[PDB]
């Protein structure tokens, strides 16, 4: 089992930055990159693929 | 400050390509690989002002004198960051007080394409309806960033009119502009919103947040420099 936040689609947020973050994609089983706006990040938002896989792998 | 050696020509979503080097204070904030994540403005040879949510670190670099990010031959200045001064009052929940200062390791070499923007006085009053300009390499369509620097003219909005849309999300260190057919977008954050003060381009806002789809009919929100300039001056004086 894994946290439900791992199943949420990536959330860019309202800020206008172009920051590379990782999110777990349950459809592929891998952590993918996405553009984060810089504020109000949801939990399926990681600074590294490793952090993401350790938190959401297998969801 | 505020006087480009190369004059801009004005007729970011629905903006236009800027005249190369016409916004000399505009810098690109990039990681160690050259990836652009935010914009910023030079306020002097050793300091850059940007947004706090950009999360700049001493591992990132300030790129000055740039126009075409797709041109490897274009001459630019890659400047290292010595220290990052994030306003301690930055609210990560409301996004208020969204400003950060970057102290460069080595001073930038001012020239025809690299110079500073002017800072306003805390008591300056830039009236609603005033036509200002914002620039940056943010998305032009809500997608990859445009290679060449973009610009857009847009009006400042009264807090009353801005709140007609954003309501109580508008805080005291924020100023709105836009909802006029143009919009800042991913990659523009930290960049400048400038208006002329006695003929000199002065930093009135710092790209912060807004429509999650970069809608051109919605007010764009910027960090209000007049409400944060005293903090800027105090930081420079102590460093």
From Swiss-Prot, chain A:
Tell me where in or outside the cell this protein is found.
Secreted
Transmembrane helix among keywords = no
Q: Name one GO cellular component term.
A: extracellular space
Q: Does the keyword Iron apply?
A: no
Task: Enumerate the transmembrane spans.
Answer: none
Biological process (GO), any one: negative regulation of thrombin-activated receptor signaling pathway
The disulfide bridges present are 6-56, 15-39, 31-52
In chain numbering, where does the site feature Reactive bond for trypsin fall? 16-17
The protein's superkingdom reads: Eukaryota
All copies of domain BPTI/Kunitz inhibitor, residue ranges: 6-56
Q: What is its main location?
A: secreted
Q: Per its record, what are the GO molecular function terms? A: calcium ion binding; molecular function inhibitor activity; potassium channel inhibitor activity; protease binding; serine-type endopeptidase inhibitor activity; sulfate binding; zymogen binding
UniProt keywords, alphabetically: Disulfide bond, Pharmaceutical, Protease inhibitor, Secreted, Serine protease inhibitor, Signal
This molecule's function is given as: Inhibits trypsin, kallikrein, chymotrypsin, and plasmin.
In Swiss-Prot or TrEMBL terms, this protein is called Pancreatic trypsin inhibitor
Curated annotation (Swiss-Prot), chain B:
> Which part of the chain is the Peptidase S1 domain?
12-237
Disulfide connectivity for this sequence is 1-118, 38-54, 132-195, 162-176, 185-214
- The active site consists of 53, 98, 189
Q: What is its main location?
A: secreted
EC numbers listed for it are 3.4.21.1
Please cite one Gene Ontology biological process associated with this protein. Answer: digestion
Pfam families in the cross-refs: Trypsin
> PROSITE patterns, alphabetically?
TRYPSIN_DOM (PS50240), TRYPSIN_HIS (PS00134), TRYPSIN_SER (PS00135)
Q: Which GO terms describe its molecular function?
A: serine-type endopeptidase activity; serpin family protein binding
What keywords would UniProt list here?
Digestion, Disulfide bond, Hydrolase, Protease, Secreted, Serine protease, Zymogen
- Subcellular location(s) per record: Secreted, Extracellular space
InterPro entries this protein is in? Peptidase_S1_PA, Peptidase_S1_PA_chymotrypsin, Peptidase_S1A, Trypsin_dom, TRYPSIN_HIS, TRYPSIN_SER
**One Gene Ontology cellular component:** extracellular region
Q: Which PANTHER family match?
A: CHYMOTRYPSIN-LIKE PROTEASE CTRL-1, CHYMOTRYPSIN-RELATED
Q: Which family does it belong to?
A: Belongs to the peptidase S1 family.
Recorded protein name is: Chymotrypsinogen A
Q: Which organism is it from?
A: Bos taurus
State the organism's lineage: Eukaryota, Metazoa, Chordata, Craniata, Vertebrata
């Amino acid at each position: 089992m894994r946290p439900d936040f791992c199943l949420e689609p990536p959330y860019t947020g309202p800020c206008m930055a172009r920051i590379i973050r990782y999110f777990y994609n349950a459809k592929a089983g891998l952590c993918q990159t996405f553009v984060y706006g810089g504020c109000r990040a949801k939990r399926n938002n990681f600074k590294s693929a490793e952090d993401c896989l350790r938190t959401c792998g297998g969801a | 400050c505020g006087v480009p050696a190369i004059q801009p020509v004005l007729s970011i979503v629905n903006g236009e390509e800027a005249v190369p080097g016409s916004w000399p204070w505009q810098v690109s904030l990039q990681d160690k690989t050259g990836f652009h994540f935010c914009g910023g403005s030079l306020i002097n040879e050793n300091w850059v002002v940007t947004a706090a949510h950009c999360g700049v670190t001493t591992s990132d670099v300030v790129v000055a004198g740039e126009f075409d990010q797709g041109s490897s031959s274009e001459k630019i200045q890659k400047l290292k960051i010595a220290k990052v001064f994030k306003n301690s009052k930055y609210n990560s929940l409301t996004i208020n007080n969204d400003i950060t200062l970057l102290k460069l390791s080595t001073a930038a070499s001012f020239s025809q394409t690299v110079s500073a923007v002017c800072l306003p006085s805390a008591s300056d009053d830039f009236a609603a309806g005033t036509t200002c300009v914002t620039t940056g390499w943010g998305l032009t369509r809500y997608a990859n960033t445009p290679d060449r620097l973009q610009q857009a003219s847009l009006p400042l909005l009264s807090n009353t009119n801005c709140k007609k849309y954003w309501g109580t999300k508008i805080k005291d260190a924020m100023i709105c502009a836009g909802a006029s057919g143009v919009s800042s977008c991913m990659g523009d954050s930290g960049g400048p919103l400038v208006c002329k003060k006695n003929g000199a381009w002065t930093l009135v806002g710092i790209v912060s947040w807004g429509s999650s789809t970069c809608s051109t009919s919605t007010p764009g929100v910027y960090a209000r420099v007049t409400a944060l300039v005293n903090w800027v001056q105090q930081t420079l004086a102590a460093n």
